Amino acid sequence: PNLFVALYDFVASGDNTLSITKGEKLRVLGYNHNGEWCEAQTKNGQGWVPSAYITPV
């Protein structure tokens, strides 16, 4: 039941990216082609975040 946590703050930059805070929880829907970006949902919204900035809880 695939819940995750943010390892660092990430400030939204480009096209359909989402801001996240260190230690907040999110839900993963998927990945991009090469797998460096992850599409996620939080209490603020939905959007792209770096794959390297998150981990399971």
Starting at the edge strand found earlier in the chain, the sheet holding 54-56 runs: 45-50, 37-42, 25-31, 3-6, 54-56
Q: Confirm or reject CATH 1.20.80.30 for domain 1-57, answering yes or no.
A: no
9: helix, strand or coil = coil
Length reported for the chain: 57
Q: Report the structure determination method.
A: X-ray
**Which amino acid, residue 42?**
T
CA-CA distance, 15 to 46, in Å (whole number)?
12
Q: How far is 41 from 28, CA to CA, in rounded Å?
A: 7
Provide the residue ranges of all domains of the chain, joining segments of one domain with +: 1-57
Distance CA 55, CA 53 (A): 7
- C-alpha neighbours within 13 Å on the C-beta side of residue 25: 5
Task: Enter the tokens of residue 12.
Answer: 């939204």
Q: Where are the beta strands (DSSP E) in the chain?
A: 3-6, 25-31, 37-42, 45-50, 54-56
**How far is residue 15's CA from residue 4's CA, in Å, rounded to a whole number?**
22
In terms of Cα–Cα distance, which of 53, 43, 41 is closest to 11?
Answer: 53
